[PDB]
């Protein structure tokens, strides 16, 4: 049921970079 893909990575890296 849990879904992991490339977009979860990029949003994680974005969140880190911007904060």
């Amino acid at each position, epitope marked *: 049921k849990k*879904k*992991w*893909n*490339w*977009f979860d*990575i*990029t*949003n994680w*890296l*974005w969140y*880190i*970079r*911007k904060k």
Partner: antibody, heavy 132, light 110 residues
Framework: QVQLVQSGGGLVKPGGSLTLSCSASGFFFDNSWMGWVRQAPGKGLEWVGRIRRLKDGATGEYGAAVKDRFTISRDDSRNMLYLHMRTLKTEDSGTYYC???????????????????????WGRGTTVIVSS | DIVMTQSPSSVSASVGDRVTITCRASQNIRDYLNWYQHKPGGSPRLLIYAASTLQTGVPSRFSGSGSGNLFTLTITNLQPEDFATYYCQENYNTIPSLSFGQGTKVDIRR
């Protein structure tokens, strides 16, 4: 392997509506971005639009030539991708492919948050002819 | 927003030759570029993403290079199954345009 079967399309007069469908199997449909690409007779490929996962909001993004006229939707319970086409014009005729899209994260720190994006698996295509 | 211009629009080659297709972007798009293969009455096929990363299952005959606004697809030792039309595609805009080049058709030389 990934299998995509398309249905719908056909003949419609200009100004009419039409819905294309794409049923998927062989991969985790719910965890995939999907889209559509078209080719007019005697012309090259043209991106139509894409849709994100439901957990991403199921946001539809569209090419400029079809924006405000076409909408994409998905039914995860049936592994169905749809392209809703209204106010059709003759220049909308052509072969429409549904695509399974994929991304790859950019790792350069200055570009964290961005991704390469590409159409990884293409359907066989469905013909649409807008004519009176 | 972004226009992709491929050249040549057509080229004739024989089996075993080196064919080079060029793609020019109307602005700097870094390495956000795809290459596709398309045969008549067939479905388009992804060859390369990120300008130079080969998709799994693609013969090493295909290689992509370039960055900024000038890109190339090279096919070494052309094979019979490589006669087809080839498209580049930008994936640079955050608000996607995903523009394709007009396509290059690779014909048989005689």
């Amino acid at each position: 392997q990934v299998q995509l079967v398309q249905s719908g399309g056909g003949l419609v007069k200009p100004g009419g509506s039409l819905t294309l469908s794409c049923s998927a199997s062989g991969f985790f449909f719910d965890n995939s971005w999907m889209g559509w690409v078209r080719q007019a007779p005697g012309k090259g490929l043209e991106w139509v639009g894409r849709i994100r996962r439901l957990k991403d909001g199921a946001t539809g993004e569209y090419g400029a030539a079809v924006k405000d006229r076409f909408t994409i939707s998905r039914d995860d319970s049936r592994n169905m991708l749809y392209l809703h086409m209204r106010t059709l014009k003759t220049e909308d005729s052509g072969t429409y492919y549904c695509t399974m899209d994929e991304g790859t994260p950019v790792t350069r720190f200055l570009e964290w948050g961005y991704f390469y994006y590409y159409m990884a698996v293409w359907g066989r295509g469905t013909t649409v002819i807008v004519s009176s | 927003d972004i226009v992709m211009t491929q050249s040549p629009s057509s080229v004739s080659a024989s089996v075993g030759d080196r064919v080079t297709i060029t793609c020019r972007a109307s602005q700097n798009i870094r390495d956000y570029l795809n290459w596709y293969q398309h045969k008549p009455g067939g479905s388009p096929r992804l060859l390369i993403y990120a300008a130079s990363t080969l998709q799994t299952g693609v013969p090493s005959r295909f290689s992509g290079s370039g960055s900024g606004n000038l890109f190339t697809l090279t096919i070494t030792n052309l094979q019979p199954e490589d006669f087809a039309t080839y498209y580049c595609q930008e994936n640079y805009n955050t608000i996607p345009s995903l523009s394709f080049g007009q396509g290059t058709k690779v014909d048989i030389r005689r």
